[PDB]
Design a protein around this ligand. Structure first.
Ligand SMILES: Cc1cc(F)c(-c2ccc([C@H]3[C@H](C#N)N[C@H]3CF)cc2)c(F)c1
Ligand SMILES: Cc1cc(F)c(-c2ccc([C@H]3[C@H](C#N)N[C@H]3CF)cc2)c(F)c1
Ligand SMILES: C=C(NCc1c(COP(=O)(O)O)cnc(C)c1O)C(=O)O
Ligand SMILES: C=C(NCc1c(COP(=O)(O)O)cnc(C)c1O)C(=O)O
Ligand SMILES: [Cs+]
Ligand SMILES: [Cs+]
Ligand SMILES: [Cs+]
Ligand SMILES: [Cs+]
Ligand SMILES: [Cs+]
Lengths: 248, 399, 404, 249
């Protein structure tokens, strides 16, 4: 009937604010510490958790996240550790989605991964290297197992492709990247009501406030990894600051 | 043609080889390149510029030479060498680069980037960019800058900027990752001159089309010299550009065996190899669905080979389609086997081959013993061995 | 059919008079094998079966014909003249040397010789000889100057991979003229079984004529290609001049074209006024050196002045006798080109055309640029790009500050 | 008329012996020392002195002579210093011929060098890199200035070239080179009566006696340079032993 993350953006729209979306890669600095940090995000006010699957060749990830996933893979992180991390988040009352590259899903099996992700309490899948043109197996798996499919749009996206990408998305649309971020959100809102998340290398409470003025959700990742690297208390404080910037 | 993919770049229908496994951020320029290639591939002005550069600048056609002194070392078979080593810059890479560099100019791009492993594609790209007045940046793994240092200095002399990639295994797959990150950021003014028959559509098809001239020449030359079509056509297989280029003209000749030889490093049982078809499995990697060396979670297993050009854990999707259809067989050749063929080709025919091409020569010797006396085996001699002289002299203790 | 005899020397090897340029200034101990090579070459040069064997290797093995490329992006630096590059750099082994080596190695097989010796300076002729000896199953010994083995080290290892023994010559100036002396000593002692595959258009008869005949194919091809691409005979044909093989090879087909200027460019090193050069025609005088009577650099007593050049292939104080004859007759002009001029042209060809030339060939490119300004807009100039610069990459990178 | 070296070989053949022909390069270790050593050769029983002109690229010189000529050239030896050596040898009662590569003769002037050589008392010229095929100018200056012309023959010489080389020679024929040397002397004598000198790397009295059996003259060069390097007395001793070897009774 509706999307899985729909009720979360409705609760933020009634409370007149944007949703705080937090990213953390499984297995950094290790699997137990990453799960403890992801639980800390839920406690510190994160509306949605992006559980990252470390990939050996992450083309889209920046230096802070790439080096974190490299360390996690050196530590021996496995794909099943992500599903175990989603279950711990859903048990702790959180709302988690999985952001992965597509080959680990193909290796796992698209249907098998969707089924086991849903069974763990996962709500959706963010696919940075899977465009709708190749998402036949994923579209079917997203329907049967009732999972949101969060595709990515870009400033360089043509109008035809932006419409096709938005029409194919359930839950929210990841607007990834001057004045480009609000301009990209405006082009999405001109063709659909679906919520729009914005990732912009958010560091401070003020930056999350600027984005919450036009975006339905604010995506933070690199800063959270940097915070967790210093210490677990530093992550709580930063997540708390970011939890206040989205309410302005 | 009968062997082309659909508009989405898929070979073999339901199996799904190829496609575009890239982020949406690249789709505007990927669709831009695809349209420009479809427009220019039928433009007579474009085709005239390509033929003319291949003739007067690159030195085509490359000759076909019967290596009679190798016969006794190949079961008395008849080894014919398709002499791509005689091309300008010294390998088959110049074929694909001349087409893509002309295309980059037709699109209005002011910057050209490329990966390189053995350095031959980098030298070719730098060569065409100097000729056409285009900015050039080549990404090369730090290990590859060390063992192919001759081509690094050739690129810098040609006016190209070289960026040493130190992430990952510091080889070809890591240079491709960095060139991808570059293209994402500078897509509106930068053309990515991809060097092999892999990547997202249209690159596996477009690179093969620019390399088809190899097999088309070989098919005419073998009939003129031998009086008939060959019993087999062989080539080394890294990403697959020189193999698919000589294979293609023979696809519809049902009597012609096609064999690709991939690098097996220290041996396929050692985990220090690049035998993609022998030990890999299907998966999405570097923009295509094809075979790659991956572990149980789908993480890319790093490859190893004495040859920098074959030291790649993936393979082009059209080769995965030809393997599934059973049209082409793919066999492993180890470091030791390739180096034996290296020295043997030096002492018998006075040709110093690229260590990449030495793999194909090594497999030809084994195929010659199988097929027997009188069998005609065409070998794609993809490059010369100027870049590998230090490595080979150390291997044979000539210092 | 086969080529002519209009410009050939007499039976004694003399150009322009029975006591003129060329001849045989050799010891009596070499005359038996020299007459044997002369008889063998006179026999095979008119044998269709021999010329068929050579043409077959030239096409399928060496990759002939080499193309003729119009380097349009050089025009502005050559007074808007049109520079056409005879792309000998695309030959197997990467220079014109393979043309002469294939002929002489085929001849050495016809004579029943089992051992082949050769000198080399830039290493290109040595690699070519080692290549043919491996191809034909002949034992190969190459003599190379000690200094040249250091600045052309890439060709040293290529020769060893091909199975040849490389001997570093430590006598004299440790360069090309000294490698020739040691190769000469080898031939005197091993004339029974050894063939001397000389690498340039010099030496005693018949080597000036035989080397020229094997390089004639360059000019023959270029004369056809230039008329097809430009619509007329060129205004000039230029080449660099060491001993003179690549120059005489491209010059010869145009000798009877009276409107076609011929300019050879010799290495001037640091400058002809410094005494560190190799400008044989600019600063030398007639004398008897390395088996022929020709020009060479010599002091008041006749001792050979040691030459110097950044190019190991042009670092030779002598020159072939046919060039001396063509100069005295006024058919060819010979001009100096310094190291700096050549390296400028080296870098210009890299930047403008994506071709990395041999530092030898860069002298000819530098001279063509100057000749273009002298001739002006629209002038058609053919340049013999004798070789590629893979051997010179390390030297060139150091020159242009790509090292440190 | 007869050759300038005719009387010497006639006198040696009358005394049942071969002529001792000694080579020394001008200017080794310096010009005065080389002139002293060439005089010592005359005083020690050398019948003919080969005065060697150091050349920059001597393809026919062995390692011992090559190093000596390189040292002489570093010392600034000149072609005119070779003419002065012939004068000093003629003054001491000796008989000098000059051995030289052909280019210094061309640079000097073929006629002028023959004129000045005969004026200095020189008797002939040994031309190791000049064959009769190229000796047109030299044959003219040789007759004009009454100088002998000693060409070289080798074991590999064809019958046609050996006969033509012997015909062109005046004085003696240099038989440059195991039974190869006596066979080469036997081939020269089957066609002519001209004296024959043999170079064979002689370094002892015993070898000088072996050659004196069949040859009209014994040529020694490398051993004299090696002896001179040790000292002038060592050269006098070796030359004395060689003068005994060339004699038979
Ligand atoms: C011509 C060409 C064009 C390309 F975009 C690529 C390419 C595509 C994706 C990636 C990223 C992907 C993501 N995100 N995961 C990494 C490895 F696959 C890297 C490179 C290529 F290899 C060749
Ligand atoms: C093909 C070929 C054949 C040759 F015999 C020579 C040659 C001739 C003579 C010398 C000796 C000469 C004496 N003795 N003085 C040295 C320098 F001239 C060296 C080399 C050559 F250069 C090329
Ligand atoms: C990787 C490149 N070399 C691969 C290569 C190969 C293998 O590449 P294919 O794309 O498989 O043809 C074969 N032969 C030569 C001479 C090569 O240089 C390069 O130069 O960057
Ligand atoms: C001396 C050697 N080569 C001279 C040379 C020359 C001069 O050689 P000529 O004999 O003047 O043609 C020109 N170009 C190249 C590429 C060369 O290598 C050699 O390699 O033995
Ligand atoms: Cs440039
Ligand atoms: Cs591979
Ligand atoms: Cs060709
Ligand atoms: Cs010269
Ligand atoms: Cs410099």
């Amino acid at each position: 009937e509706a999307s899985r993350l729909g009720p979360v953006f409705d609760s933020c729209r009634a409370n007149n604010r944007a949703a705080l979306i937090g990213y953390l890669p499984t297995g950094y600095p290790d699997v137990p510490a990453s799960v403890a940090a992801m639980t800390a995000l839920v406690e510190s006010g994160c509306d949605i958790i992006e559980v990252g699957v470390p990939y050996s060749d992450p083309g889209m990830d920046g230096p802070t996240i790439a080096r974190a996933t490299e360390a996690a893979l050196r530590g021996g992180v496995r794909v099943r550790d992500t599903l175990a991390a989603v279950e711990a988040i859903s048990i702790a009352g959180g709302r988690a989605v999985v952001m992965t590259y597509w080959n680990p899903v193909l290796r796992y099996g698209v249907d098998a991964f969707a089924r086991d992700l849903a069974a763990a309490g996962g709500l959706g899948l963010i696919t940075p290297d899977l465009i709708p043109d190749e998402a036949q197996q994923w579209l079917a798996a997203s329907e049967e197992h009732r999972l949101d499919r969060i595709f990515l749009v870009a400033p360089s996206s043509t109008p035809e492709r932006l419409a096709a990408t938005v029409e194919a998305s359930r839950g929210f649309v990841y607007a990834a990247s001057s004045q480009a971020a609000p301009e990209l959100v405006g082009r999405v809102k001109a063709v659909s009501d679906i919520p729009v998340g914005v990732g912009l290398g958010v560091r401070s409470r003020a930056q999350a406030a600027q984005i919450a003025q036009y975006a339905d959700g604010v995506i933070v990742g690199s800063a959270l990894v940097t915070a967790l690297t210093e210490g677990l208390p530093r992550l709580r404080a930063l997540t708390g600051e970011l939890a206040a910037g989205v309410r302005l | 043609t009968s062997h082309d993919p659909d508009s989405g770049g898929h070979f073999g229908g339901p199996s799904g080889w190829g496609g575009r496994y890239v982020p949406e951020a690249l789709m505007a320029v990927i669709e831009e390149v695809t349209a420009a290639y479809q427009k220019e591939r039928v433009s007579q002005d474009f085709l005239d510029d390509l033929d003319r550069l291949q003739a007067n600048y690159a030195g085509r056609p490359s000759p076909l030479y019967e290596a009679t002194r190798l016969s006794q070392h190949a079961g008395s078979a008849r080894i014919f060498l398709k002499r791509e080593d005689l091309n300008h810059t010294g390998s088959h890479k110049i074929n694909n680069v001349l087409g893509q560099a002309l295309l980059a100019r037709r699109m209005g791009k002011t910057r050209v980037i490329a990966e390189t492993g053995a350095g031959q594609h980098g030298v070719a790209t730098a060569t065409a960019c100097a000729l056409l007045g285009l900015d050039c940046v080549i990404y090369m793994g730090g290990i590859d800058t060390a063992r192919q240092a001759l081509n690094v200095a050739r690129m810098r002399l040609l006016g190209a900027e070289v960026v040493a990639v130190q992430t990952g295994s510091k080889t070809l797959k890591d240079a491709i990752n960095e060139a991808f990150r570059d293209w994402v950021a500078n897509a509106d003014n930068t053309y990515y001159c991809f060097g092999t028959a892999a990547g997202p559509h249209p690159f596996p098809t477009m690179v093969r089309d620019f390399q088809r001239i190899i097999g088309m020449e070989a098919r005419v030359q073998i009939q003129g010299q031998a009086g008939r079509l060959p019993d087999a056509v062989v080539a080394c297989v890294g990403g697959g550009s020189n193999a698919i280029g000589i294979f293609h003209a023979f696809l519809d000749d049902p009597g012609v065996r096609l064999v690709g030889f991939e690098a097996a490093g220290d041996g396929v049982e050692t985990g220090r190899h690049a035998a993609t078809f022998t030990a890999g499995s299907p998966g999405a990697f570097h923009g295509s669905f094809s075979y790659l060396l991956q572990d149980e979670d789908g993480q890319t297993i790093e490859s190893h080979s004495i040859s920098a050009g074959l030291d790649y854990p993936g393979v082009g999707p059209e080769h995965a389609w030809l393997k599934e259809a059973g049209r082409v067989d793919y066999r492993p050749i180890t470091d030791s086997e390739a180096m034996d063929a290296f020295g043997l080709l030096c002492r018998m025919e006075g040709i110093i081959p690229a260590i990449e091409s030495a793999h194909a020569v090594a497999g030809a010797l084994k195929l010659g013993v199988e097929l027997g006396r009188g069998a005609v085996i065409v070998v794609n001699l993809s490059g010369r061995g100027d870049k590998d002289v230090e490595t080979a002299a150390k291997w044979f203790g000539l210092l």
